[PDB]
Structures are given as C-alpha cells and as structure tokens.
Write a protein that binds this ligand. Sequence first.
Ligand SMILES: O[C@H]1[C@H](O)[C@@H](O)OC[C@H]1O
Ligand SMILES: [Cl-]
Length: 289
Amino acid sequence: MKDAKDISVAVIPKVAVPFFDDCNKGAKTAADKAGVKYQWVVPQNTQGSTQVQIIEDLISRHVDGIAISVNEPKSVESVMKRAEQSGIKVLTYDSDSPKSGRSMYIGTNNEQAGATMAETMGKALNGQGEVAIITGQLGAVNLNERIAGIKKGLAKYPGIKVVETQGTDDDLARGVSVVETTLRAHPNLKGIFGVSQVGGPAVAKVLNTREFGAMKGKLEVLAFDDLPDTLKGLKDGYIQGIMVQRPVTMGSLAVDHLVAQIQGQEGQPKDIDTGVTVVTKDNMTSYTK
Ligand SMILES: O[C@H]1[C@H](O)[C@@H](O)OC[C@H]1O
Ligand SMILES: [Cl-]
C-alpha cells in the first residue's frame, strides 16, 4: 500500500478545450484531498498518436494511475494494455475506449442523453420540422452515441426529418461556417442540435448577426455543456435548452477511483453514470456538475 505522497496520478483530457477545465478542477480537488501527486497532461490535437505518446511517458515514469478521455478509441487500445501489464491502473472518463482493458468508465450515458434531446425537440416542435445535428470530431464515441440517440429517438416522430449531420472538430470558426451553410440551405429549418460544446456558441454567434438575426425565435436550439457562451445564448434566447454533464464530478471520481485501485481496495470496478441535467432559462443557476 503506497504512502499517499508517493502516489502519482495523471489525468488526460481530449485536448486543452473549455469543457475539460472542470474535469481538471474536480480531479485536482480530489487529488489534494487525497494527498497524492497529480498531473494534468494535455494533448495538442485530437488525433490519437498524440495520446499514445503521453501514456508511454507515464509508463516510463512508473506513475501509478492514468485517467483519460479518449478522442478515438481504437488508437489507444494497445498502449493502455501495456500500462496495465506494468501495474498502472487505468480508467476512462467522459469518452470511453471499451476495448483498452480499462478498469471502468466514468461519464455520461451518451446515447441516453441523445434520446432525451430527441424527446425534448419532438415535444417542442409538436412532432413537425426539419432539423440539423452539429457535432465535433467525427471519431468521438461519446459524440457519435449522442447522435445515434437523437436519430433513434426522432424515429418516433414521422413529421420530423434530419436534413443535415455535420462535424466541426469543435473549431468555433468551423462551427460558424457550418451553421451559416445550414441556415442558408434550409430556410424552413425548425431545429438544431449541438451535441458537442461548440454547437451552442456557434449557433448563438451566427444568430446574432445581421444576415441571420430574423431567425431568432424561429428555431428550437438544443446544445451541450454549459460554457459561458452557451449560458449567454440561453440567457439571450438564442438557445432554448442545454444538456449539462457532470465534468467536475467525473474528474473527482476519476482520481478517487484511481487512488482506490492503486491502494488495492476497489473491489471489482464498475462503470459510473454521472448523469446529465436538462437546463433551460428557468433552472440555469441551480444545476451542478
Ligand atoms: O460535450 C463535451 C464532450 O463530453 C467532451 O468529450 O468533449 C467536449 C465537449 O464536446
Ligand atoms: Cl467554443
């Protein structure tokens, strides 16, 4: 049983993007509570090779635990298995890699979150209208599950049609371009889903322009996460609903379960559904993460 101060854990986001600041906060809080050494290790891009290199270094340093949010699941399966054969405890959070041999996944039930968005939209549109889906990186499991949940849920509504599903790699400028093109192609668009953190900010940015201002109030917009721009969009009426995950709680649990596994008292890991809050203007101050 390692002395807490000799315990070393590392937490890896998909990249330095806004959502993961909360995961860092929650992990750092839990590590400090636990008295262990903690590092936040950030990829430079979303590709995959970049996260393999990080795990090899961590192997090299005989660190005790690794928690990772995975950009693309297949890429990282091989190096995560070696880490485990070196005694390193490994788990995922936010975005899973199910065949990496990781002990457990901590995060949202992403297909169910999509399903919930679909019900919200279907009710809001009275089962009628063209809709578009804006995603981030096309290889992301959690994002693709969200999309699958939306499409399966919308199948209940014959009068709704998904006319567009497009990615952005969560580049805001790319998101703006995509949203601009969508609105031009579909003047009778009735709804938009943003299943990654950029979708809300991009839709609000585009709707708040001279060219598209008249679309304000015409569309039902549902977005993911609670980035300040998204909250401002919800405040301003450009966004009608969001889905808020529990990123702080993910980071906290990630460290706590790493420590428990490292110290040999995690009897049989099990996935944790950290849950997701449907947030509108009416409850936007009282949700937690
Ligand atoms: O919605 C979140 C997602 O859970 C995470 O994986 O990437 C950042 C945001 O897109
Ligand atoms: Cl953004």
